[model samples]
Target chain A: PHMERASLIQKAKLAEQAERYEDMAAFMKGAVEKGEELSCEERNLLSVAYKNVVGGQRAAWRVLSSIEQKSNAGPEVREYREKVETELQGVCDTVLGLLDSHLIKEAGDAESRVFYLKMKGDYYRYLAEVATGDDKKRIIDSARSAYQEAMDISKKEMPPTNPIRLGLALNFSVFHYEIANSPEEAISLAKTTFDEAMADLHTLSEDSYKDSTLIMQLLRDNLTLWTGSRSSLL
Target chain B: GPHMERASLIQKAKLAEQAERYEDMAAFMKGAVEKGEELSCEERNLLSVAYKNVVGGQRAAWRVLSSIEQKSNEEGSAAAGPEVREYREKVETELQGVCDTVLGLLDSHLIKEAGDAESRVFYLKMKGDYYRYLAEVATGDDKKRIIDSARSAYQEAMDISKKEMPPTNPIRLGLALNFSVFHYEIANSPEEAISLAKTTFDEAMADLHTLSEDSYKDSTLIMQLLRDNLTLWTLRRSSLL
Candidate 1:
């Protein structure tokens, strides 16, 4: 009687438009907890809400990280850096917890499962970014496997040219490049993903045209940047 | 050790940068420049990176403060809390000092003593970049004055770029990117920004087949950025309608 999905969705959209990501995150979190099978659009809305909220905290954490490295930084700064890190960690855990315990399990099809896996990969990577000595390796491994899992599924069940496939490749390549520090694998992954997509290019939908190419260009350009190769990779 | 002292400031700045002590890095870089030592192209880029770090965080801090100040003024009070007031003033002071230091270096030394077309445009473009940063934290008539300074600084760089560097040149493309950004963000001219970006992207695309082996990476990366901005700004224009 208290929670209406329609009301929750409307409030979340308003929060999104207002750029008040914290409110958006809360509303979406509520919707997720209400326990219905979520649609792909609902899953995406949930992801975007949490992503924006976490992005700000991640930025703050990085800035505080730099400040904490100063030789003369006081205990106040260091303590606050820890405080910001905890906030970031809490947000990451909250979303990942939901994805694992509820959303991913509730998925009815390939699109939902892939979206859930991709979001899981992304948040883990965010945690890995500011993580320190002991926990970083674990978080990084978690992120890599989630992305890998998503990639494996997309190739099996989705068109190679689908934006979801290309979207996953962009982040997956970045994970290789930045997290794994393997530019060789990064460039190879980008080249293979782009070439395969271009080979099956005719299957791509018109609705996804603009969005796909933006990411397509990113994948290709990053390949060029990573390898110092000619721009025309094909 | 004594003879190596002056030449090693850049190296020490490199360490300071790695340590994330940007203030120390900046001091070391400035000391290196004051030592009457010439910098290589890589060293020049390092110097800019070190200087940028010191200035970059301060810009973010000042931006936050400025937004708070705006909120207070809008609430029908020209007052901030004492803590806010002090921190705001401190960041503004630091921002002003760094901007003046780099602008001074660019005007009197970096650009004046720059040995080649690439270096000259490099220094000029950076001068404009720093001035734009300064204008963001500056207010009243000074903001207006500094914005015009950034405009003219970029214009001069673009002038030199057209004749001295090719469209495939990274420095040339970088100057174009920043110049268009200045127009869009600082000068409040979207049409001008779009035109510059489109023209630059078009010119680069036409000459894409001719990049030297060394520049293939740099050229395409910057061209991608130009295309991204063109797509972004054009969509933004339409969405507002």
Candidate 2:
């Protein structure tokens, strides 16, 4: 079974070399699904396969974010985290440019418009992490507006608890904090989203659990800073 | 410590020269001189060559060569060693050749002549080729500066071709292809190399693709080779990743 698994990994590499990204993704996905189980090396290969198939911010973000969840603090993982961080802003800009083109092309499709709006908001949020002053304010405002539009559509069309909405709400809260005048509002929103997410954690799928864990951790970090600063000032 | 210093400086200079980093090589050698290091006969000759050919150190380099000439005459040619004599002769001859080439280019004065922008383009591209050749034998900052000079010349030629002529102008396509090759070979910009070459080739091929009958007569070979090279480069970049 290990030999068979190794062969699949080898074929995935060959597919990557051949630039058949679809086949590469399939082989890696197949490897992950097989009952043989994967070592860290095989899992890393799958991550790389995923990365190559979509060299977007989402790909970089998902790969790094998921890996960070379960990884021990090893030098390799640390280096990878740094690499992902370095590439994140640049990759977000690239993906946003691509989405701008798609947004124009799919202007007639309501679902696609809503979906791309959420994604644009997501990328803008990433960009805001590295931006400063006026630029930061502009991007955060844009993110807030885009996420609000997505939520408006989701109110009628999408399920209220669509994981995407949770992402939107959580990120929007972060946007509130970035503006500096709304720590109270940011914490309140973050706390509500965190509790709602935690209550459903047992029922969530593994992928959902990964995202929820990330958002929950972000909320905790945000709240800790808020409370820590308040105590010091008082 | 002084002997070790001399050895390391000389080694680094030699390495830089080999890498076409003539600026770094010259700087290293100059540092050695500042530190009161005495260069060997061969090292002095090599430094002079770098100064003359790469640095436009014509006055200084020639002065050194003149001293060597006077020394050899006084001591008899055989005492100066054949290696030293040969290098002096080589630099003297090549420097004259380089001078003549530059003189010929300036004398042509295509830039001043009315309605000769095409000729000017040709002249600029030729200048770029010369600098590119100079860059090949140089290293470090000198190499980078020379490559920058070459890129500027190529860009000027490209601008004239695009602005004054049509897209299918043979001169425009030729300059585009040559500039792409220059980037690929020397600019340390693989992405730009692939992009410029791929785009120019594709544009030309779109016009030429239907003309299979006289394709061989009309740059079919150049197109095929350009495509092949692009594919090779793409594969090379992938493997590196």
Candidate 3:
């Protein structure tokens, strides 16, 4: 069982590094169950791996506390230690509050900012699909602010030569165009971003080709239905 | 008294810089005229450069925040590199703090392009450099694509100095040094980087040496470190260029 548990832990790490969250979660859960009888260090690693994908912030905090008890981390692994100590607990508390508040009414900027801070806005958008009534509205509202904030920064800062900004503009633009009842604003921002992209075409052309492909691909998949209806729009 | 006030300003500014309180640093300097005794010509001139540093830090903060936010939306499968879960959270909060500082400075109107002929040009230079540095930290193909545009922003500042300032503006020298640092860091060979770094440091010294006396402060320290850095890089190369 220990060997099996170690195998699962190894797979969990590889999956996490590879960004394969679903598989990472599955492997971590298995390791957690089988490693129940292990040492403190082992439990600490198992908990961090578990929380990283499926379990959310509480699990992550539990992982941190476990690590603290064992004092197993080397200097190399001590990065982000300040953040865990300073704000991890507060972040978890805020996220839980936002989730509960979303049950009654659409979330506003404050709630959305907290969601963005937690790096869970994507999960919020995913939840919107199954959410009903005000819950759905809150998720959508939170997501829209997150998208607009990205768009605003891209337009106001980041060089026009950078296709990363262009790609971001396209993704967030479409999010507004499709989901948040803000298609006109979305198209306006996207067009301006696209023009900025083309304005620096001479400087950006050599390196922006791959980024351009990604931008085009995202636009193709996510253009609002109304976008097709308007010929000259964008 | 002027010297004591100037020293106090510098000390306060360092404290702000270390804590990453960029807006406070900028605001504190801008208000020095009222809070502290009159400054000498040299201290007055140095204040403008201090303003540029605060602006630059704020811009870098915003870029980091925006990038992290975009990355947050990316499918976990698409995210890459050294984004540890704990560190991701830490970096984002740090970025947010930066954004707050920038917004505060802007609210104080310290960031605006002003009406004064000399100040207007300096303000533009600050603005352009702010955007340029923001583009540099972005990874992926974004860095290469934006390099020239970013460089052009630096050039805009240089153009201002050529049009207005005399034999050597410390601001221009500082910007030039910053550009050289970026260019050398991106160079293919450490030898080329070493050569460029030396030139930049020498130029920095040339501008600083023109001052009557206070140029002695931090001059030896900065120059010695620069020399050591260039030598280390040269040694790293298989053969010198």
| Residue B104 shift from truth in candidate 3, angstroms | 12
Off by over 4 Å in 1: A1-234, B1-4, B72-82, B212-214, B235-241
- Which 10 consecutive residues of model 2 chain A have the lowest summed lDDT? A101-110
Off by over 4 Å in 3: A1-39, A42-234, B1-112, B115-141, B162-170, B187-210, B218-229, B232-241
**Candidate 2 runs further than 4 Å off:** A1-91, A103-115, A132-137, A155-161, A179-181, A198-214, A228-234, B1-241
DockQ of each: 0.02, 0.00, 0.01
Chain A TM-scores, per candidate, are: 0.90, 0.47, 0.46
Instruction: Indicate whether candidate 2 or candidate 3 has the larger DockQ.
Output: 3
Per-residue CA lDDT of model 3 for B75-144, tens digit only, reads: 4866533323433343334444443443344334532424443454444444444434544445667656
In candidate 1 the C-alpha lDDT for residue A71 amounts to 49
Best by lDDT: 1
For B34-120, candidate 2 gives per-residue lDDT tens digits of: 455344546654554454445353323434554665586678545543433443444445554564444343334323342456565
**Tens-digit lDDT string for candidate 1 (B1-241):** 2443655577666655554556656777777776665667877887798888778767766666666656765786456444344445656787789989988877766888778888888988999999998877777999999999999989999999999888888999999999999899888999999999999988888888887777788899999999999978982344553
Which order, best to worst by lDDT? 1, 2, 3
